[PDB]
Design a protein around this ligand. Structure first.
Ligand SMILES: *[C@@H]1O[C@H](CO)[C@@H](O)[C@H](O)[C@H]1NC(C)=O
Lengths: 49, 50
């Protein structure tokens, strides 16, 4: 009389997680003003110094 | 099997796999540029300019 018994059990659990994020913001607001008063025209020729 | 000589034998295997995959990607971009310029030749230095 002889009895042979054998068993086996195995589990290999893997897990992976990956994330990525990026945010950007840019602003270039500007303003300008010109308050004019008067204009003149200098004579080109026949002028005194 | 046995015959009255006995021969013994027995086997039982079990295998199992569980795989998983998931990916997610989201992008959101918004750009707005607004410029308003008004040229007025009304004839007011300071008050007309304002
Ligand atoms: C193996 O062990 C891991 C860790 O506890 C478990 O998450 C997994 O479910 C096990 N395998 C089985 C088939 O249950």
């Amino acid at each position: 009389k002889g009895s042979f018994r054998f068993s086996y059990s195995k589990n290999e659990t893997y897990q992976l997680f990956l994330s990525y994020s990026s945010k950007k913001e840019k602003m270039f607001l500007h303003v300008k003003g010109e308050i004019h008063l008067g204009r003149f025209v200098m004579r080109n020729r026949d002028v005194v110094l | 099997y046995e015959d009255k000589i006995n021969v013994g034998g027995g086997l039982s295997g079990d295998h199992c796999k569980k795989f998983g995959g998931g990916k997610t990607e989201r992008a959101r971009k918004a750009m707005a540029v607004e410029d308003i310029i008004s040229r007025v030749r009304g004839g007011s230095s300071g008050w007309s300019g304002g």
